[PDB]
């Protein structure tokens, strides 16, 4: 009866989340049962459509992590349908302006704070009759910062009330700056921008997150004060693990 | 226009294969593009049903590994439908007797060698008009040895003409012997049985395979002369990788 | 070869429709065979995506009710794809302005009345070669009135030619007015607004519908003159029925 | 970390279960959250295949009822795959002989008690490292008694160690006796047979269950001492509820 | 309220049926609306599993042809589940003996004529309360004759009461005789065997069918007196049509 | 490691493509293996949703044609998700203005040429580490011209840099001009408009395509100089083929 990520924050610690680009419920449950506070399902850069995401949300909740979705787009009705299917965290890509951030916020709250349409099929099952009064608190929302334009507008994005803060997409950000879209990059301009976004988010009293490609980079980000750190995509972890098993198997 | 595992064998080397318990095409293609000769899809201990296996076979072939299936059961019509969907390797569980091995063989060959029903939807697309004449060679079949009874009958199982040999299921085998179902076990009685099956398979001029849970164990099995070595299940590799990313991320 | 709801209207009676939030074809057909003129599939507050709605439309038609969809959003291309999949009634949520009502109308008619794209896969199978000439009549469209803003703009919404009228979403409407989102509410301000919308719809010579949560409320709405009354959601009816079976079973 | 039905029994009370013929997770979770100890998914007389049952098992567990399956057939490998997908109760239809009952039992226990193949994908996630030692206790198995032949062999069926008892299929039983296949029948010969099966099951110290079509009949069966009572199918409850809503809506 | 194929027969004409190896509802409905009396869905040599066949049965019925299935195997519980999903014709492959023909018949009739389990989800919706009394007549069953063994046993297969007759699988039959598995073959031994099966079926007062690969061959078979003629597989027709469109498009 | 359609163009010949309105992988692979340079999957006038398109892209690539999609709408995030699923050609419907053409172009190129978001799940598997540098060349984009408005704006649409040119939708175009939406029409005004669009596309040094309903019409279009010609929809070809098989079968 609490959003596990909001509970981390309220208790003075950051949240660590998984990141899924592969459809299906078995690995979603298995990863959720690990020491992840949340598991994010990626609906942008994956083959995961709505019909596949819906059972995954159930599986993550059963496993004991908060189900989050990184949506394909910042679209209010898409977001609302995920909320009603038991997505309790929403990370919306490519939020570049205050207005777009206000569109995200509008989907996450009922009237009068937002315009979320009422029909909370799965949240009502989870939270019971008192859901409406606590509904906003049950959902975490983060706007993604992934372009030079979003960088330019970061303080104004951060001034939007109905979102908890921002989530950096560092490979898109690197690419828009003219650099290779390398995860966990050391490119100075990208590193500088990432720090700046974190500094501005905290100056505004908001939360800041970042997508990580390794456990070591994630540790550093937590030490730097990021409130929400993901590490690492299921497909990338599995590929790397398989490459290593093959190398070990085929070694002389 | 050749079965990649049979090509390994014909060229004097063993085959290394992947092992999938998670449904979906993206990781299947990605793992197939690694230095695996085959990728086995597990339809026994997984949620993978026929509707999910069918696109995975396509994805593995595109990725450049031979698509194999470990079936739910040694059932001829199930096996035939997979063959016609472009499974080119069949590993049938719990083959305990010569008769059961003859049932497996019967599904893998057309008349007069077997009773496979004719309608090769995807093999005909892959191999063209000459498929019928080469059809038996396009498919690898292995009977699984997983019980004390299968151990007792190993020479008779190995005497069946229409299968390439046997595939050891070492966790089931350990359990039937009264030991913990540990993968890559060191339990002497299980290790002894595994060696014995390999020795008998080669004494019969047949192929022998084994399921491995790690790259190091797989290396040893290849050195011991196993012809077909799988390593390691996608779900197990992904779980272990995630546990390590989390440990690294949360370390002080 | 007629839209069953339009036939009710043309013959001087209202239409009673079912309302489905559960995916699947078996209950859709079974409910369609009851004395429902239409069955509405809810794609907003449900886990029903396009891949699941498509066979349900077939099942409702076979069962003998007109297949309707309440869409996730008032989006023209989404609506057109449903029309071509054999949705013959469209209820679009959250239609708040004349312009948004004109967007809905544009999707429901071919040129020159609208901009519906031509490729009527299933309507052409149902209606044959004469489909094009009668296509507009084969589809019912209703704009949903669910906010204070939609209330403010009701006469202008009702002035849009290409829609048959409006469909009240009374739980959203109650919530936007600051009241509990109770179905079949007695809250005076909400009841007053609902009556007003009905009065304005009929003053404009248009049709008016309303979502009901019970058979008794639905009877009253029909008596008040609503032209299209839904009652009641499959999930709500099933839950209530199960609660009662359990109470009866566990009673002393 | 306990099978909820076995816990009822161990604590001196019967279990009441739901019964689902409609695929999908939303109603499965919603019904599971009611005061049902278990929810049975019917894979015999429904369109529910393996790909649809798998997420339903997850949803029922999350909702707080024990997930059960009435299988299509008493087939060991089918049953094992459901066990590994997190079915914790198995009701097998048309168990007519001691041998068939022994086949059911063989699938539900690992060696040496049975021949269940080892790869417990979801039970291991639920129960953790100690699963193997408690695995038999985590699963309930019931053989269905549905024919004159099963009646003739009831004591011998009941003598099989590895099943908890029997589950009466009273419409099939009525039909095989030459009577209408009416649920909750009053036909004396069928009523007499049902009582006899219950009496013999308890004389053998085993559990007995029965499929019910109403809450009142279910109450009587619990009073008569049945240990496992289902009531009533989702589709039948929903159909009846819809018929009543329509009758109420269309009444003058 | 009648099986369209049985109506052909009762009215003194043969039945012509379609044959589908491609999953999906759109072409199934479209072909059903043509002058086919039935459409057969092939679950043996196709990727069509149960989850895909179920909506196709609905679509064929809506289109106005009798839905038939050629099953993967002659398995009673598989057949019963299709019957309850609204398959009204069953063609079972590889029926080689009287006993196997008796197994097929047993699945198609309720007690006392057969052992079909009672739960007719979709037939009860189609036929209403009087279904039970007419259930046998609503289903057509044909045993496939596809091997030398089935040829050897043809009179005994034909003596089985509960099946309408036999359906020749001529490519399998050719292959078992040592000839190329060519559809619509002119190979004398195969042609002779096909005629013999027809002659014996009619000498027994039973129905006989045959799979055809072209409209011309199908015409000849109807003229020779076959009672049930299929022509031709959707995939084969579509492939041939596409080849011709390409040849026409690329011609100088 | 090349887009097959771009290779046609670079080598001085047009491309001929298939057109699929039926979901599924088997016919997609089979048609791809014919002498089609590309196969277009229609997501506008079909029941093909994202979950169904994804495996079809894999199947077309394996078959040896370039996978293209005609999307439901010109929506950047929809297009990006298809690109990352291995759509290598995008045909966007109802592109009516320069601005809408610029929206299409923006989705097809990474920064700085466009705003495509980075996460190329399947293109990176196909093209390897050098993908980013060649990514724009791997994708073909065409804007559809289907209205009087698009005709009015054709030169301005053609002036957009990031698209290869335009694709005529001639049935929509005919309908918007007030004529019957006949494929391969002879209506002078429509024929004149089609020629004009081709002439303007080539005057701008861009590519022009057209949807054809027959091989003969397609031949003429290639002779007239169209660079990308589709012929003909799978459903239309299959329907016509079945009608002819039935006519031949039922002829005296
Ligand atoms: O739309 C209204 C609610 O979602 C019905 O449950
Ligand atoms: O459960 C949902 C809300 O609390 C009802 O108003
Ligand atoms: O069954 C015969 C063949 O499979 C038809 O293609
Ligand atoms: O392609 C299949 C076989 O070769 C035809 O006989
Ligand atoms: O787009 C054109 C039509 O839909 C083709 O059937
Ligand atoms: O069927 C569709 C239309 O009537 C053809 O113009
Ligand atoms: O078959 C062996 C086990 O299931 C692998 O996880
Ligand atoms: O989790 C499964 C078993 O307990 C491992 O032996
Ligand atoms: O099994 C009994 C019947 O199918 C319940 O509807
Ligand atoms: O509908 C099914 C049967 O007729 C009921 O006995
Ligand atoms: O979003 C970032 C990338 O897609 C992660 O793989
Ligand atoms: O594979 C994708 C790109 O080339 C990495 O930058
Ligand atoms: Br952990
Ligand atoms: Br699902
Ligand atoms: Br990464
Ligand atoms: Br590698
Ligand atoms: Br598929
Ligand atoms: Br392992
Ligand atoms: Br009724
Ligand atoms: Br479907
Ligand atoms: Br309600
Ligand atoms: Br309750
Ligand atoms: Br699932
Ligand atoms: Br019932
Ligand atoms: Br026709
Ligand atoms: Br379905
Ligand atoms: Br053929
Ligand atoms: Br060709
Ligand atoms: Br897929
Ligand atoms: Br066409
Ligand atoms: K956790
Ligand atoms: K490989
Ligand atoms: K009706
Ligand atoms: K419960
Ligand atoms: K017909
Ligand atoms: K090709
Ligand atoms: Mg990004
Ligand atoms: Mg095993
Ligand atoms: Mg609403
Ligand atoms: Mg029964
Ligand atoms: Mg055959
Ligand atoms: Mg068009």
Chains D and B are in contact, defined as 3 or more C-beta pairs closer than 8 angstroms: yes
Q: What are phi and psi of E234, to 5 degrees?
A: -55, -50
- Chains D and F touching, counted as 3 or more CB pairs less than 8 Å apart: no
What one-character-per-residue DSSP string does F172-189 give? HHHHHTTS---TT---HH
* Residue E148: cis peptide before it, omega within 30 degrees of 0: no
Contact E52, E28 (CB under 8 A): no
Given CB atoms, is A237 within the 8 Å cutoff of chain B?
A: yes
Tokens representing C87 are 């949705």
d(C-alpha A20, C-alpha A29), whole Å: 11
CA distance C31 to D235: 10
Q: Say which DSSP state B251 is in.
A: -
Q: In chain F, count of helices (H) and strands (E)? A: 13, 8
Kindly tell me the sign of the dihedral angle through the C-alpha atoms of C200, C203, C206, C211.
Answer: positive
Q: Do E164 and E206 meet the contact criterion of CB atoms below 8 Å apart?
A: yes
Q: Quick check: CB of D45 below 6 Å from ligand 9?
A: yes
Task: Specify the residue for token string 């350990």.
Answer: B174
The rounded distance, in Å, linking the Cα atoms of C155 and C168 is 14
Q: Which residues are CB-contacts of E229 (< 8 A; sequence separation ≥ 6)?
A: E14, E15, E16, E17, E209, E210, E212, E218, E221, E222, F249
| Interchain proximity C246–D25, CB inside 8 Å | no
DSSP 8-state secondary structure symbol assigned to residue B33: T
Helices and strands per DSSP (H, E), number in chain A = 13, 8
Gap between the Cα atoms of B162 and B143, Å rounded: 11
Q: Given 3-state DSSP classes, what are the helix, strand and coil percentages for chain C, each rounded to the nearest 5?
A: 50, 15, 35
Q: Which residues pair with A78 in a beta bridge?
A: none
CA A147 – CA B248 distance, rounded (Å): 29
The CA angle D152-D158-D162, to the nearest 5 degrees, is: 140
Three-state secondary structure along C154-197?
Answer: HHHHHCCCCCCEEEECHHHHHHHCCCCCCCCCCCHHHHHHHHHH
Do D74 and D95 meet the contact criterion of CB atoms below 8 Å apart? yes
| Nearest-angstrom CA–CA distance, A140 and E213 | 60
Check if the beta carbon of residue A175 is closer than 8 Å to that of residue A40: no
List residues bridging with F137 in a β-sheet. Answer: none
Task: Specify which residues D142 forms β-bridges with.
Answer: D91, D165
Q: Which residues surround ligand 40, an ion (CB under 5 A)?
A: D 146, 169, 172; E 117
By DSSP bridging, strand C207-211 and strand A66-70 are: unpaired
- Please check whether residue E165 is in contact with residue E201, taking contact to mean a CB–CB distance below 8 angstroms: yes
Helix (H) or strand (E) holding A231: strand A228-233
CA of C188 to the centre of ligand 21 (A): 19
Chains that touch D (3 or more CB pairs under 8 A): A, B, C, E
**Do A72 and A21 contact (CB within 8 A), yes or no?**
no
| Cβ proximity of E88 and E39 under 8 Å | no
Residue nearest to atom 4 of ligand 5 (CA): C119
Chain A: list its partners (3+ Cβ pairs within 8 Å): B, C, D, F
End-to-end CA distance of chain E: 54
Place of tokens 């040429």: F113
Q: Report the chain B residue with the minimal C-alpha distance to residue D112.
A: B176
Query: CA–CA separation, F192 vs F174, rounded Å?
Result: 11
Q: Which residue in F243, F209, F217 sits closest to F14, CA to CA?
A: F209
Q: Do B62 and F63 lie within an 8 Å CB cutoff?
A: no
Find the residue in C nearest to D18 (Cα).
Answer: C242
Provide, as residue numbers in chain E, all residues whose Cβ is less than 8 Å from the Cβ of B81: 44-45, 72
Q: Are C172 and C119 in contact (CB under 8 A)?
A: no
Examine residue F232 and say whether the peptide bond preceding it is cis (omega within 30 degrees of 0): yes
Q: Among all chains, which residue has been given the structure tokens 């803003």?
A: C149
Distance from the Cα of C207 to chain E's closest Cα (Å) equals: 30
Helices and strands: H and E segment counts in chain C: 13, 8
**Entry resolution in angstroms?**
1.6
Residue A2 and residue A88 in contact, taking contact as beta carbons nearer than 8 Å: no
CA nearest neighbour of C29 among C62, C55, C2: C62
Round to whole Å and give the CA distance between F242 and C227.
Answer: 43
Which ligand is nearest to the Cα of residue E144, counting in written order? 41
Residue C110 near residue C135 (C-beta atoms within 8 A): yes
Q: From the CB of residue C35, how many other CB atoms can be counted at a distance below 10 Å?
A: 13
CB proximity C81 to F under 8 Å: yes
Query: Which residues, in sequence order, are CB contacts of C49 under 8 Å at separation 6+?
Result: A49, A50, A51, A54, C43, F49, F51
Distance A66 CA to ligand 31 centre (A): 8
Query: Phi/psi class of residue D49: alpha, beta or left (left: φ > 0; alpha: ψ in -120 to 50)?
Result: beta
Distance A169 CA to ligand 11 centre (A): 8
Encoded tokens for A86 = 């038991």
What residue ranges in F83-236 does DSSP mark as E strands?
89-92, 140-145, 165-168, 207-211, 228-233
- The helix (H) or strand (E) run that includes residue F15 is strand F15-20
Task: List CB contacts of E77: < 8 A, sequence separation 6 or more.
Answer: D44, D72, D73, D75, D93, E107, E117
- Residue where the block lists tokens 């492939």: E239
- CA E58, E63, E64, E70 torsion: positive or negative? negative
Helix H or strand E encompassing F191: helix F188-203
Nearest CA of chain C to the CA of D38: how many Å? 12
Report the separation in Å between the CA atom of A30 and the middle of ligand 13, taken as the mean of its atom positions: 10
Tokens of D136: 């038999």
The C-alpha torsion from F232 through F238 and F241 to F247, rounded to 10°, is -140
> How far apart are alpha carbons B197 and F31 in whole angstroms?
46
Q: Is B45 left (phi over 0), alpha (psi -120 to 50) or beta?
A: beta
Q: CB of B40 within 8 A of CB of B12?
A: no
Is beta strand C140-145 parallel, antiparallel or unpaired with respect to C165-168? Answer: parallel
N-to-C CA span, chain C? 54
Region of residue C205 (phi > 0: left; psi between -120 and 50: alpha; otherwise: beta): left
Collapsing DSSP to helix, strand or coil, C19 comes out as strand
Neighbours of A248 (CB within 10 A): 16
Domain limits, chain A: 1-252
User: Ligand 11 pocket test: which of A20, A22, A42 has the largest number of ligand atoms within 8 Å of its C-beta?
Assistant: A42
C-beta separation of E47 from E77 below 8 A: no
Let me know the angle formed at the C-alpha of B210 by B205 and B212, rounded to the nearest 5 degrees.
155
Selecting from F75, F171, F235 the residue whose C-beta is nearest the C-beta of C118 gives F171
Which pairs count as long-range contacts for D126-131, CB under 8 Å and 24+ apart, including other chains?
Answer: D126/D1, D126/D61, D126/D86, D127/D1, D128/D1
Structure tokens at A1: 């009866």
Residue E55: asked if its preceding bond is cis (omega within 30°), the reply is no
Active site residues per annotation of C: 45
How far apart (Å, rounded) are the C-alpha atoms in residues A105 and A123? Answer: 18
Burial B189-224 (b: 16+ CB within 10 A, else e): ebeebbeebbebbbebebbbbbbbbbbebbbebbee
In angstroms, rounded to a whole number, what is the distance separating the alpha carbons of residues A222 and D51? 40
- Please give the Cα distance from E119 to E121 (Å, whole number): 6
Residue B170 host element (H or E): helix B170-176
**Experimental technique behind these coordinates:** X-ray
Report the distance separating Cα A248 and Cα A11, nearest Å.
43
Residue A180 buriedness (CB in 10 A; 0-12 / 13-18 / 19+): exposed
Among C35, C36, C243, beta carbon nearest to D34:
C243
What is the Cα gyration radius of chain D?
A: 18
CA dist C174 → B83, C188, D80, E140 (Å): 59, 10, 50, 56
Q: What Cα–Cα distance (Å) separates residue E230 from each residue in E37, E68, E216?
A: 10, 11, 12
The C-alpha atoms of residue B79 and residue B82 are separated, in whole angstroms, by 5
Backbone angles phi, psi at C41, to 5 degrees: -100, 125
Number of Cβ within a 10 Å radius of residue F64 = 15
The position carrying tokens 């006469």 is C155
In angstroms, the CA A225 to CA B237 distance is: 30
In contact, E85 and E121? CB cutoff 8 Å: yes
B113 touching F, CB under 8 A?
no
DSSP E180-221: ---TT---HHHHHHHHHHHHHHHHTT-EEEEE-SSHHHHHHH
User: Greatest CA separation found in chain E?
Assistant: 68
Structural tokens at position D241: 């509820």
Give the C-alpha separation, F12 to F16, whole Å. Answer: 13
Under a CB-based contact definition with an 8 Å cutoff, are residues D194 and D222 in contact?
A: no
Q: Is C151 helix (H, G, I), strand (E, B) or coil?
A: helix
Q: In which residue are the tokens 């093909």 written?
A: F48
What is the distance in A from the centroid of ligand 6 to the CA of A112? 47
Which three-class secondary structure state does DSSP give residue F160? coil
Task: Give the nearest partner residue to C34 out of D23, D25, D242, using CB atoms.
Answer: D242
User: What are E7's two structure tokens?
Assistant: 């109506």
Which chain C residues are closer than 8 Å to A120 by Cβ? Answer: 45
Q: What is the DSSP string of A41-98?
A: EESSSSS--HHHHHHHHHHHHHHTSEEEEE-SS--HHHHHHHHHTT--EEEES---SH
Q: Enumerate the β-bridge partners of residue F89.
A: F68, F140
DSSP letter assigned to residue B90? E
C118 near C109, Cβ under 8 Å?
no
**Chain D nearest CA to C241, separation (Å):** 6
- Can you say how many angstroms the Cα of residue B73 is from the centroid of all Cα atoms in its chain? 13
- 3-class secondary structure, B187: coil
Taking each helix axis from N to C end, the angle separating F98-108 and F76-84, rounded to the nearest 10 degrees, works out to 30
Closest CA to E156 of E169, E146, E143, E141: E143
Is the preceding omega at residue D112 within 30 degrees of 0, hence cis? yes
Residue pair B63/B90 in contact (Cβ under 8 Å)? The answer is no
Backbone angles phi, psi at F68, to 5 degrees: -115, 155
Sign of the dihedral through C-alpha C194, C195, C196, C201: positive
- F121 half-sphere exposure, CB direction, 13 A CA radius: 30
Which residue in D173, D103, D177 sits closest to D145, CA to CA?
D173
Q: What is chain C's Cα-based Rg?
A: 18
Alpha-carbon distance values, D89 to D59, D157, D227 (Å):
15, 18, 14
Q: Cα separation of F182 and F175, whole Å?
A: 9
F172-208: buried (b, 16+ CB within 10 Å) or exposed (e) per residue?
A: bbbbbbeeebebbbeeeebeebbeebbebbbebebbb
User: Which residues have CB under 8 Å from C133's CB, separation 6+?
Assistant: none
Chain D partners of C248 at a C-beta cutoff of 8 Å? Answer: 214-216, 218-219
Find the distance separating the first CA and the last CA of chain D, reported in whole Å: 54
Do D127 and A34 form a contact (C-beta atoms < 8 A)?
no
Question: DSSP label at F137?
Answer: G
Long-range contacts at A71-74 (CB < 8 A, ≥ 24 apart): A71/A43, A71/A44, A72/A43, A72/A44, A72/F77, A72/F78, A72/F81, A73/A44, A73/F77, A74/A100, A74/A103, A74/A104, A74/A143
Helices (H), chain E: 4-10, 26-32, 50-63, 76-84, 98-108, 121-127, 131-134, 148-152, 154-158, 170-176, 188-203, 215-224, 234-250
Nearest to E166 by CA among E113, E206, E219, E220: E206
CA distance E221 to A171: 65
Q: Is B133 helix (H, G, I), strand (E, B) or coil?
A: helix
- Three-state SS string across chain D, please? CCCHHHHHHHCCCCEEEEEECCCCCHHHHHHHCCCCCEEEEECCCCCCCHHHHHHHHHHHHHHCCEEEEECCCCCHHHHHHHHHCCCCEEEECCCCCHHHHHHHHHHHCCCCCCCCCCCCHHHHHHHHHHHHHHCHHHCEEEEEECCHHHHHCHHHHHCCCCCCEEEECHHHHHHHCCCCCCCCCCCHHHHHHHHHHHHHHHHCCCEEEEECCCHHHHHHHHHHCCCEEEEEEHHHHHHHHHHHHHHHHHCC
C-alpha torsion angle, residues C48, C50, C56, C57 (rounded to 10): 130
Structure tokens at D71: 């299988």
């Amino acid at each position: 009866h609490h959003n596990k990520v909001r509970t981390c924050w309220n208790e003075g610690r950051p949240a660590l989340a998984g990141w899924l680009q592969l459809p299906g419920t078995l690995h979603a449950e298995a990863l959720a049962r690990l020491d992840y506070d949340a598991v994010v399902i990626d609906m942008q850069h994956s083959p995961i459509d709505f019909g596949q995401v819906a059972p995954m949300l159930i599986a993550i909740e059963l496993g004991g992590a908060e189900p989050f979705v990184r949506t394909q787009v910042n679209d209010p009705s898409d977001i609302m349908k995920l909320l009603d299917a038991g997505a309790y965290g929403i990370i919306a890509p490519m939020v570049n302006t205050r207005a777009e951030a206000q569109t995200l916020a509008s989907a996450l709250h009922y009237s009068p704070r937002g315009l979320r349409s009422f029909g909370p099929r799965r949240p009502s099952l989870r939270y019971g009759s008192g859901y409406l009064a606590q509904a906003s608190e049950t959902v975490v929302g983060l706007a993604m910062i992934e372009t030079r334009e979003a960088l330019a507008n970061i303080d104004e994005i951060l001034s939007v009330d109905g979102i908890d803060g921002v989530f950096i997409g560092p490979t898109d950000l690197a690419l828009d700056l003219g650099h290779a879209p390398l995860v966990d990059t050391e490119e100075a301009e990208v590193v500088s921008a990432i720090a700046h976004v974190r500094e501005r988010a905290h100056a505004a009293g908001k939360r800041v997150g970042i997508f990580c490609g390794s456990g070591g980079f994630a540790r550093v980000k937590l030490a730097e004060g990021f409130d929400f750190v993901t590490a690492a995509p299921d497909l990338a972890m599995l590929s790397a693990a398989a490459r290593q098993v093959i190398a070990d198997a085929r070694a002389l």
